[PDB]
Amino acid sequence: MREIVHIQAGQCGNQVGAAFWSTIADEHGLDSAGIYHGTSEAQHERLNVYFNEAAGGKYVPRAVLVDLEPGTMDAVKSGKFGNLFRPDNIIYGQSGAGNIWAKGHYTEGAELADAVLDVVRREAEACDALQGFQLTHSLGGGTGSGMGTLLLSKIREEYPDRMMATFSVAPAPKSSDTVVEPYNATLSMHQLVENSDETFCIDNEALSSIFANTLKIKSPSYDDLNHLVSAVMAGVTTSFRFPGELNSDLRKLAVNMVPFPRHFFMVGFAPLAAIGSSSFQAVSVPELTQQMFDANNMMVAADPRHGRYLTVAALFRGKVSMKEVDEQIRSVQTKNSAYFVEWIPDNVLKAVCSVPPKDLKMSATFIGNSTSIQEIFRRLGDQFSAMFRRKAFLHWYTGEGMDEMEFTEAESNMNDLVSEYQQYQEAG
Amino acid sequence: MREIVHIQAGQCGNQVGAAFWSTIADEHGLDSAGIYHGTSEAQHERLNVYFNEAAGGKYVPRAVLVDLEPGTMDAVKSGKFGNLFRPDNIIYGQSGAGNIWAKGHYTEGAELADAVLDVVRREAEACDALQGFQLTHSLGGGTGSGMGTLLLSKIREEYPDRMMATFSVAPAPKSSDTVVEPYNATLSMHQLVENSDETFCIDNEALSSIFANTLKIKSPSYDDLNHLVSAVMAGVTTSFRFPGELNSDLRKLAVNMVPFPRHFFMVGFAPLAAIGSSSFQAVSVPELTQQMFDANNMMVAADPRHGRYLTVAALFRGKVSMKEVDEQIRSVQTKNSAYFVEWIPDNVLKAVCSVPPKDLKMSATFIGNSTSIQEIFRRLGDQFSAMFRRKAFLHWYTGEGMDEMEFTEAESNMNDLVSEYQQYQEAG
Amino acid sequence: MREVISVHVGQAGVQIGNACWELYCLEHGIGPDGFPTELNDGFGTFFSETGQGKFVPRSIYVDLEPNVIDQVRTGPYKDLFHPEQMVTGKEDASNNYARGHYTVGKEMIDSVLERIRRMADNCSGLQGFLVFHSFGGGTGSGLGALLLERLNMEYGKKSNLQFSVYPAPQVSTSVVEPYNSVLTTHATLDNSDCTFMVDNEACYDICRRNLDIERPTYENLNRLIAQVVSSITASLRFAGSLNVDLNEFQTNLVPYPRIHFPLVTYSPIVSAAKAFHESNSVQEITNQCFEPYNQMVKCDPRTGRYMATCLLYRGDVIPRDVQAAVTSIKSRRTIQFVDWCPTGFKIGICYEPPQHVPGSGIAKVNRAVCMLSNTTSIAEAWSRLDHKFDLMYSKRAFVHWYVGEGMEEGEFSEAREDLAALERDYEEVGQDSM
Amino acid sequence: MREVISVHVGQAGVQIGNACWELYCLEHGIGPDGFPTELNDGFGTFFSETGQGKFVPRSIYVDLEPNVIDQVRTGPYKDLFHPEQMVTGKEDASNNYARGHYTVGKEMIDSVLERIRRMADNCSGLQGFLVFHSFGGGTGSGLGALLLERLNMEYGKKSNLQFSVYPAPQVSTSVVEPYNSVLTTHATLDNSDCTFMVDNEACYDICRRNLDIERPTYENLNRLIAQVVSSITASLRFAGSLNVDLNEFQTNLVPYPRIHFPLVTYSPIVSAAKAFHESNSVQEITNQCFEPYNQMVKCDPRTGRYMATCLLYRGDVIPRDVQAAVTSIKSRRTIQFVDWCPTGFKIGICYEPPQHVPGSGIAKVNRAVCMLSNTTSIAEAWSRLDHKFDLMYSKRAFVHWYVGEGMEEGEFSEAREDLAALERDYEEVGQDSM
């Protein structure tokens, strides 16, 4: 019944579970205890996606929370929601990853990979029909950046028809975590592009701009940060997980987007407001569409005004027509006609879902494609290569088992991406 | 539906909002809370002008209150009516303007202009059809005198069909605020004449004469001063904003007035009385017309008896005929026939609106044109040029980015105005 | 079925019809909701009936304000029209001919011209169509002159009547009434078959004396013009004694294709106490209809000589009291001459008594007279305009706001020129020799 | 008993029938549970009855989602169908022709083809069968084109009608609507006897003006297409005056076997307040059905010349008001010519009045018109596709996701080629000389 098995990796790659899973329970009317409490009968017919049925209504979240160090793993165990996940799927090593890629990709995950795949296999064939797999991790760290990629390439070597879809979070332009965060980003992209289809890129610093610019809070914390970018994982399945009028799926959101095997694009929300900014509007699709236009409601630290929109899919939920979107999309595609790609007339995808979220009459989820996602990788590439000139921190990788020229290959892998996005910025 | 988006600038340029907006709510039957309380069904069919519709009847005032210093901006925020405006449109800088023109026009507003235009654009295309824009500010200060003009010239460079109409307040003949108030007045007129159509000129000192001469209060304050000159902003839209028998609009009040691109004329009220002077009259159109004749019921500190009436438009509200105005306008145009301009026979415009204001059976709004508005600028020009002879206070302008001979140009710009009004004082 | 349709452009053309159709609904027993009836052909005259029994007033409404039009749907006639026929405009720039003509009013025309079309697709016996506007309007002067010039371009031989209203000799309603009125007599010169025009200040002058009300309004002036309409139209919608067609006027008023500006004289207009203590016989009315006290247009028709004049009588009329009256007018010095018609009359008799609306202060009467008088004097209000309009143009006053809306001043160069031939035409008819 | 069966493939084909059968149940007095009745042959027309008195709608449902199909068993028609006929698919890869055609949709076919079989084993008088899909679908475009090509391979001479819906000139629902729609006119070229297609944005254009609702939905568009169905089908399921068979269309619309794309024009479609203040006679409707305001497909049928057009009338109709109307269309300039039929019409009369569903804002009427118009202009939306589709193929955009699902691009090489002959065919009929 078109279902997904969930995979996390890394510390903050595991932190996103609670913003995900407590929402998707609340989106499906489900408590902390797992037992059922839902209002409408609308929220059942596609409930089977992110949940395996249980004895006595428990409705276990199909997930495997994976990490290399037991620091943050007990935190969601010993905290609340300690009875949602089944601890057979909680696995974690003890020795530190040191957030070094090949330590996390090549060798210490290989201590734990043998326990990984026997977990997800018996999860896979107990499902009816897999729709796909989700990988949420980091680009910057080591555990999520390294171990999930080796974890990915085995799964893509087992299920070549099944779709592989990934979420990940970006290195920052200014607010970076560590100094090998250039190396981890390049090495992560070497496996994402080759194995999985689609990956999205979320700057924490641009996420920090959101509550700064839009919601006006001087001091949010990460439990507000993941709480916001949670709902796009809700939003991509919003179309899917309960009925509507039109909606399609992530594989149908895969083939429509890109004319090539080269899949990266953007994320945004609609609507969005502050505390006191709530009631002073008229929340509607013209209110929705303009928070689906700015870079300020995006996640990528790159300018669509520097870029060009390849393809757009829009995912609405609530009482919403088409012509309220039609007349409004036409009102903004005309003034911004040079912002579209002339390879495709009408690269707009419309999808209308039924029920609203909590306390909001409408909601929309943004998917727009760009040429300026190279503005990440050009900002990455010279951030990468300048730390290769003196072979910066090289012995923490070649002192673990990887050839240095294998690291040089991923540069051209990044440059193979940019070489295409060099063209469709200005060609045709 | 023939609608207006509102713009203020400067401290007292923002003070006029409460005298405006609490009246136009009360003129439309609307509370402090924004939610609807109106008696007749008469006050709805043109309610859409100064208000954007909202969710739950809130009916937000379409306004953007703009300033350079956060002194007086919080005062209407933290005071009452703090839930009328939406705070997304409340913008204000922190560093002082020092009420110096090019500091407010050229450079510090340029810190805030980038946030200005993205506010009014999304306000503009969310409207049905713009009727125009209102700019209310000061001539004497820096923020309203400077920043709104640079704000104006971008809008007039965006919407060349849409009408630009401005209210402003004059330097005083005797009761002046500051000593650069000559410079700010000249520099403000350099942008008003070139960009917008019409501007009106209100002396505070002549306004101080009104409660002195007519209403007999020794000590009014500014919250009585703006409260009086509020109702002409009501009066110019009185014809427009709810039905009647004949009425026209401000663009129709633009093309009828002036035979040239040179647009300035006067403001007055009818009726008007004191506290105990209320019931001792017979309030009617002959009572209205004679308070539409004196300089004492005007606003400009200039003599129409020194001047000559180019064109006149009258805007009545209440139960009122035409012949009660006709026989009365003919009774005063004959005794004062030399006071009219012989280029145009019958430069009178009649417009009759329906419902009366609060507790008054009739009301009228005065529009009369003059030749003696040069009596402002001649009083300005030698007040200007005498502070150029020694280059008075010149380093607070050229120490900010403007060439001194650019300041000399606006003198001839003032002298280009007076050169025409030199003629039609006595010619033809 | 000998049927005709009436357009309404301009804010005057709004409120004029609000008296005209009110009279029309009372002159057939039509309830104000359209669903009527609280002659034989009469019950379906101005009205393309549906089988539901209510019926559409065959009209149209043209305005670029939504202001005064939506007063009707607020007002008591909310079920009379239908919301296709009542075409509004969302925005307006009125008092501006050459954008109400050439920019903003033209965007309504293709929507307007369709609604002319289907209403011409039921009225099998079509007698041209009727036009209401003003000169004191911008857009009614503006779109109205544009309205005729494609319809007469379409409909060719069809009849074109209009009841206009022009800015007074003494009281204007706007300063543009030299400008954005006097040019519109270009397009309406060669598109209006006949036309008619009337003064407020003359009609107000009747109100202070023959109606004796110190403070009247537009509505009372609207009611007074409105009976002149039904004196012409609904007379053929009622089986009279000597029937008068619409087409008879345009062939009994013009010797020459330009001269189609007659007068209006309506009488008796008699106040409430004035009808009592008084017998108004038919010659008592016709001796008033040549006296200037019931005169609709503030001019001097005494001084000028009359040209040709049709008369329409309502109610209980004999032709003997006509000929006993009308042989006294031609004897009397207060007319002197026609040279070009030794008779100079057209007499018409319909039996339907004068309809008396309840609200206004007009009084009921058992006989009525309508007068359409061509003269050698009516060009003086035109000469008033030439005294006015050539003075404004002696300064070039917002030629920009005739230019910037999209028209050069070559028509203003043509403006007095066509007016000059109109002045030349009355002295041409003023030529009376061998 | 002159009976026919309607397949439903594609998510459009789901919701289209949810208006069609709703109309079908109201047009025979059928309770929504199937157990009916809160003409003679009429009570058993679309329905293979059981002795229990409830009866099966002779349909099928094909979709590869379980999503929208299971809404029916949640919805109020839970007892109407039966859970053999309603065949779903457990998984889906839609917007993907060549696996909905060649990989994933083909696994349902042997289950589908059995259910075609036994429903053809009771309907003794079989008149072909009816096909619903979309072009904006993947699988309804995908499995649908595959659905015809074996059925017409089986059933040979049997009738093949389909009501399609294509991606608009202005608003798409997906980017694949160049790709995974325009190829499906290959298989449906030589497997559909006749076909029909309609636009949302044109049907939405009717909703803002003739229905006057700012925010409509699919369901209202579903109800509007649905009456066109029963205007054709149930007309022979009712004893009319000049009966029209299904087989008459496919021999009165095509001079040549390719040209089977007519128009749809349905009228009157009249809003709630619009029916009041209005009499819609039959020629009042037919003068609207040639005007583009009631036009179903956003094209230019004014510019092109009409070829041949059958008409279907419901309710209280005389042929004299037909011939009085239809002699005015052929006179009028808004059509100019047929060269290949000097008559160019087919007239058909059924007495059953237009069914008026309660919920939607459509208004009731006592007469109806359906129009199926062949023209010399309908290939321009095809030429819109050739402007679109040849541009996508000028980059080879997920040819892999046409290849990797199991088909080389030789059909894409064939794609514009068969389209080019379609464009060549209308200029071939555009040849009008000696």
Ligand SMILES: Nc1nc2c(ncn2[C@@H]2O[C@H](COP(=O)(O)OP(=O)(O)OP(=O)(O)O)[C@@H](O)[C@H]2O)c(=O)[nH]1
């Ligand atoms: N409504 C109305 N107008 C009258 C009447 N009598 C004279 N008028 C003239 O009709 C004109 C009305 O047109 P406008 O004043 O321009 O109002 P409007 O809606 O802008 O009309 P348009 O220019 O056609 O759009 C006025 O100038 C009056 O001079 C009357 O009784 N009723």
Ligand SMILES: Nc1nc2c(ncn2[C@@H]2O[C@H](COP(=O)(O)OP(=O)(O)OP(=O)(O)O)[C@@H](O)[C@H]2O)c(=O)[nH]1
């Ligand atoms: N259900 C429905 N679809 C409509 C309607 N009107 C137009 N459509 C079109 O129908 C298409 C629906 O097919 P899909 O969007 O592909 O949904 P689906 O379940 O994947 O359909 P398949 O591809 O056949 O499996 C859309 O592209 C719309 O363009 C309508 O009223 N109802």
Ligand SMILES: Nc1nc2c(ncn2[C@@H]2O[C@H](COP(=O)(O)OP(=O)(O)O)[C@@H](O)[C@H]2O)c(=O)[nH]1
């Ligand atoms: N999703 C998410 N990521 C974060 C947050 N804060 C920091 N990060 C990034 O997530 C990564 C956290 O590092 P870590 O999880 O230890 O990397 P690991 O070695 O793969 O486990 C770093 O690269 C941070 O840049 C957050 O609140 N949410």
Ligand SMILES: Nc1nc2c(ncn2[C@@H]2O[C@H](COP(=O)(O)OP(=O)(O)O)[C@@H](O)[C@H]2O)c(=O)[nH]1
């Ligand atoms: N509208 C208004 N203006 C005033 C009042 N009192 C003083 N002014 C004038 O308004 C200006 C106030 O200066 P300010 O607003 O600080 O100038 P700014 O630099 O543009 O903000 C001065 O030029 C005064 O002459 C008042 O009560 N109402």
